[PDB]
Amino acid sequence: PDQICIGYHANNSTEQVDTIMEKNVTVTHAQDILEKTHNGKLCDLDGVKPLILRDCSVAGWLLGNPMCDEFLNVPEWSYIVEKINPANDLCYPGNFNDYEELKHLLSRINHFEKIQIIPKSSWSDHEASAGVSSACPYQGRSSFFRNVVWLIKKDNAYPTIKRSYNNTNQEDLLVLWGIHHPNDAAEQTRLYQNPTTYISVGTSTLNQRLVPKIATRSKVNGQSGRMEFFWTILKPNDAINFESNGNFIAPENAYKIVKKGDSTIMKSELEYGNCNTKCQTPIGAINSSMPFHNIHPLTIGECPKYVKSSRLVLATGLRN
């Protein structure tokens, strides 16, 4: 007796998927769509090495903390890597003004060319070679930030400084400077002679006048003094004009912003890994064609979409 029947594919695939009203349901085929594995290291991003700051912070890098000499004139980078709590920061204690806003600009920048805008030899009526502190050691001795100069009085006098610099470059220029807050009236005249001092800084947008704040402070890295640092972007054809009769930590070097583009500041404890990748997270690089991953929320490059799912599998075949 002749016959024909309708049936379907079955096999020994134990692989399971979930649905709205049915957990752990076995199917003949199932497509995983989530990537859970990473290579565990920090890589070049499509052939461009990152700037690994090791034990230095951004502030320590840019101001020129003596411990940070590896980073004096760094090459172009894809991303920047910094530790969560870096050792080499403001060696002389104090603060970096508008620091996180500076950092935010830095995540859109891929390369600096550091240039000398005020020579250390150019200070003829001030002492420019003794601005050092045991707070900033270098090879067993007192030193200081490399890109700014702590000037003091010369021959019991501090003449009023008037310096200008016109940015005759085609690029934007990050310019840094600071002020020293001394411990007391005696320190003030010992270092700068004049008891009442200021620092004027103007550009086309900046109109700044700083006065030192004397107070009695706890020792940080052996110092009760403080330095407060500032910055601005000096546009092509604008000029920055400094004036001061004391407490001025003057610019020596500044930074031409030579490459802008996609970048970021990752927090990571990892060191460089000698690998290349299309996708970096702070905890590992990723090499995948999956649409989703669950490694880390913060990534850069050609990456899949992050989810917090532990598991994500699509049903493809029939029930089994």
């Binding site: 379907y8 970021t264 500041i265 979409k305 992050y306 989810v307 799912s309």
Partner: protein, 148 residues
């Protein structure tokens, strides 16, 4: 139907014929084609709809910007929870549809054989059909072909 057939590794849906000549399986290519397209359309459509998903960005705040630091945190976690929800919820719902979609194509294929031979064959109930005449291998292919 009791269950699936392991003896058919040719495709997802098909037929098993029993004949004076012989007996063996045969996959339905027109019906399998429609399913591979409908599944491949779905999986790709899930990926493309999700590529507009939120991308988090590291933002740094100082110790007197705690409120906005928290706000920033809430906002980014918020979006990642939403999109995680959307990814999971879509997968669960898509799996339900995909399993029920394969079911539908077995019912519809069973009806086509019931319709193609209505009065020349009796339905048994277990997913089969007994001919009331002799159907040789060319005839059996005709039932698989569609022209009959």
């Amino acid at each position: 139907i009791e269950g699936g057939w392991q003896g058919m590794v040719d495709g997802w849906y098909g037929y098993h014929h029993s004949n004076e000549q012989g007996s063996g399986y045969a996959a339905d290519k027109e019906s399998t084609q429609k399913a591979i397209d409908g599944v491949t359309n779905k999986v790709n459509s899930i990926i493309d709809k999700m590529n507009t998903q939120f991308e988090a960005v590291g933002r740094e705040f100082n110790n007197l910007e705690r409120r906005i630091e928290n706000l920033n945190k809430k906002m980014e976690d918020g979006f990642l929870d939403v999109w995680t929800y959307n990814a999971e919820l879509l997968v669960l719902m898509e799996n339900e549809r995909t399993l029920d979609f394969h079911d539908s194509n077995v019912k519809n294929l069973y009806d086509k054989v019931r319709l193609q031979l209505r009065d020349n064959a009796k339905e048994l109930g277990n997913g089969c059909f007994e001919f009331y005449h002799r159907c040789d291998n060319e005839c059996m292919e005709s039932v698989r072909n569609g022209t009959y």
